[PDB]
Amino acid sequence: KLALDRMRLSTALKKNLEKISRQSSVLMDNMKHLLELNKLIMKSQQESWD
């Protein structure tokens, strides 16, 4: 069930990708914040490894 749902979301998201980079939406903002987080988390993970 989960795999089917993810595939559906991926294809629908692909079909409307051009509309997304027009942006000027709350969802576009959320994506910019998400990029900032992931980077910090991965750096902290590497330091913990060492």
Add this chain to the structure above:
Amino acid sequence: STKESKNEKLKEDLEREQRWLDEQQQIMESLNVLHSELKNKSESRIFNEL
């Protein structure tokens, strides 16, 4: 936030364990020397000192 807290605790634990290891190495050297010295180191003789 949780990852940051984990990293801080890891650093503090690291310094503390380093100090403990140093002290324990000193103690081990002392024990080795003492056992070596003791290993390197009857009625008639006892009656003599009295």
